[PDB]
Amino acid sequence: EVQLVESGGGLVQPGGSLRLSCAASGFDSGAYLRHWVRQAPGKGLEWVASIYPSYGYTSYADSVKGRFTISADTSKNTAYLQMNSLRAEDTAVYYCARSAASYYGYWHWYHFSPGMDYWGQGTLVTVSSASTKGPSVFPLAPSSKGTAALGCLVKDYFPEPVTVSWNSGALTSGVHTFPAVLQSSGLYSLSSVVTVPSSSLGTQTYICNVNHKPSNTKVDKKVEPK
Amino acid sequence: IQMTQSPSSLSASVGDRVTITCRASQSVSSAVAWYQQKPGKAPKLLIYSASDLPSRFSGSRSGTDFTLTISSLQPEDFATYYCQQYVSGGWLITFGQGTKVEIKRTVAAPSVFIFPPSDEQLKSGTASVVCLLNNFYPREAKVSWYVDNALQSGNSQESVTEQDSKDSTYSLSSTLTLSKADYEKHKVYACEVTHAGLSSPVTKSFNRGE
């Protein structure tokens, strides 16, 4: 019935600082090693820092040495990870984890250390020197005549969370909304496509609704054969 | 930092004996842990070292190559698996590169569509021609971009779905971001798809710009 709750994340442009936090619940923080492990979007797992809160022992990965400060509060049962002089490629989801024990194990037999039984669920940290901009949405309009396909192109929007549905929740079967990829411009770009019978053109209306909560922006583009 | 995991993106179906291998960091018989990461969820632990020991997940230690041989494969397990070690040096923790298991099905060929950029876009000042590989199985596919019969490189971007809940197939989004000026300087634009399903590279194209 124990849990890890991790907070702090958000957007900050490179060179700034952004402190993380990890509330621990249900177990004794001072008899369990605490580690911060991050995962860049679509990349693997990369360890960041580790602490033995009781004795204060600290350990970092050399990709980040000299910038991050891992810390713990025994009274508040919460472990911190001060991220300083943040770099552009630090963008990842930062996880908080647990390990077992042993002053003896730490010093002498550290390799034979048991696993990370409980992790939190994550806090997202994005670093970019780019203002938040709503997406400009562009139609795709098929000219192909059986079953043809059409879609939208939402491009040049910051930050990530963008949602696409078709005909206000109607078109579900065949909806293929891709995952966004951030362009060289620093802004993300995305495309949604759907499969429909060739008969549907000239009969059915097709409109994608794209909401961008961070910019407080909703856009609708009707897609019609040219 | 980068541990070597021998399968990178290998796929099988439910009820299959699958083995994943990990290269070690230092040399000394160390401790090993493995994690399951389902998409958009936090990783969870499976097994540990020394005494490795449900019925399916089992770890084995061969020389410098640690293994996670899962025997009875259930649909709940299709996920990504990571290998992690503790190194008694800098008190550092190092992970494997991750290995994903996607479902295995018969072979499906892409439904290839090409869309020239919208007029609403080129007045703004950028042209984004997009190609659509639609529901296909093998996930391995080459999408070559030919403007005026010249395979342009260093401008396209790719995007893939994970897998459809019904057919367990993929889709690809090649997006070419050419400037408005450099878009209208050429006429024929083509998208070339090389994939295992199709017998010969299938290309769909259009003709506008000059």
**Could you tell me which of B87, B50, B89, B54 has the C-alpha nearest to residue B70?**
B54
Helix (H, G, I), strand (E, B) or coil at A40: coil
Cβ distance of A176 and B91 shorter than 8 Å? no
User: Which long-range CB contacts under 8 A does A200-205 form with residues at least 24 apart?
Assistant: A201/A142, A201/A148, A201/A225, A205/A167
Distance from CA of B18 to the nearest CA of A (A): 21
A36 and chain B in contact, CB less than 8 A? no
Model resolution, angstroms? 3.5
CB-facing half-sphere around the CA of B205: CA atoms within 13 A: 17
Per-residue buried b or exposed e for A34-72, using 16+ beta carbons within 10 Å of the residue's own CB: bbbbbbeeeebbbbbbbbbbbeeeebbbeebeeebebbb
**CATH H-level, domain A3-127: superfamily:** Immunoglobulins (2.60.40.10)
Distance from the Cα of A142 to chain B's closest Cα (Å) equals: 7
End-to-end CA distance of chain B: 51
Task: Name the residue facing B43 among A110, A119, A176 (closest C-beta).
Answer: A119
Q: What does the block give as tokens for A102?
A: 């042993």
Q: Note whether A61 contacts B: Cβ–Cβ < 8 A.
A: yes
Alpha carbon of B31: minimum distance to chain A alpha carbons (Å):
5
Of B30, B95, B171, the CB nearest to A45: B95
User: To 5 degrees, how large is the angle CA B76–CA B79–CA B83?
Assistant: 125
Which residue matches tokens 């293994």?
B67
Topology agreement, domain A3-127 and domain A136-222: yes
Q: What radius of gyration do chain B's Cα atoms show?
A: 22
Using DSSP, state whether B81 is helix, strand or coil.
strand
**Burial state string for B39-76 with b = 16 or more CB within 10 A and e = fewer than 16:** eeebbebbbbbeeeeeeebebebeeeebbbebeebeee
* Spatial distance between the Cα atoms of B50 and B45, rounded to a whole number of angstroms: 16
Q: How far is A190 from chain B (nearest CA, A)?
A: 9
3-class secondary-structure state, position A213: helix
**Rounded to a whole number, what is the largest CA-CA distance in chain B?**
71
d(CA A36, CA B92): 12
DSSP class per residue in B7-30: -SS----SS--EEEEEE-SSSS--
Q: Is A1 helix (H, G, I), strand (E, B) or coil?
A: coil
> Does A93 touch chain B if contact means CB atoms closer than 8 Å?
no
Instruction: Please tell me the number of Cα atoms within 13 Å of A129 on its side-chain side.
Output: 6
A155 touches chain B (CB under 8 A): yes
Q: How far is CA A93 from CA A25, A42, A43, A85, A126, in A?
A: 21, 10, 10, 18, 8
Pairs across A and B, CB distance < 8 A:
141
Short-list A49, A28, A24, CA closest to A101: A28
Distances in Å between the alpha carbon of B182 and those of A136, A177, B118, B185, B205? 21, 28, 16, 5, 18
- B69 and chain A in contact, CB less than 8 A: no
One fold for B18-100 and B112-207: yes
A175 touches chain B (CB under 8 A): no
CA angle (B86 as vertex; B81, B92 as ends), nearest 5: 110
Task: Establish if B124 touches chain A: CB-CB under 8 angstroms.
Answer: yes
CB B59 within 8 A of CB B49: yes
Q: Which of A4, A59, A113, A117 to mutate to test the interface with B (most CBs of B within 10 A)?
A: A113
Which residue shows structure tokens 């099905």?
B105
Is residue B67 helix, strand or coil?
strand
Cβ distance B1 to A63 less than 8 Å, yes or no, reads yes
d(CA B110, CA A135): 29
Q: Which fold has domain B112-207?
A: Immunoglobulin-like (2.60.40)
Q: What is the CATH number of domain B18-100?
A: 2.60.40.10
| CATH code for residues A136-222 | 2.60.40.10
Dihedral of the alpha carbons of A126, A129, A132, A133, in degrees to the nearest 10: -130
What are the sequence ranges of the domains in chain A? 3-127, 136-222
For chain B, the domains span: 18-100, 112-207
Least Cα separation, residue A75 to chain B (angstroms)? 25
Whether A103 contacts chain B with CB within 8 A? no
Tokens at B28, concatenated: 């000394």
Phi, psi angle pair for B149, to nearest 5°: 55, 45
Nearest to B36 by CA among A45, A96, A90: A45
Question: In this complex, is the C-beta atom of A42 within 8 Å of any C-beta atom belonging to chain B?
Answer: no
Angle at A152 between CA A149 and CA A154, to 5 degrees: 155
* Residue A174 neighbours by CB under 8 Å, 6+ apart: A194, A195, A196
* Cα–Cα distance, B210 to B197 (Å, whole number): 35
Which stretch of DSSP H or E encloses residue B105?
A: none
Experimental method: X-ray
CA atoms within 13 A on the CB side of B74: 5
Between strands A78-83 and A18-25, the pairing is antiparallel
* B118 interfacial to chain A (CB closer than 8 Å): yes
Name the token pair of A203.
Answer: 């009969």
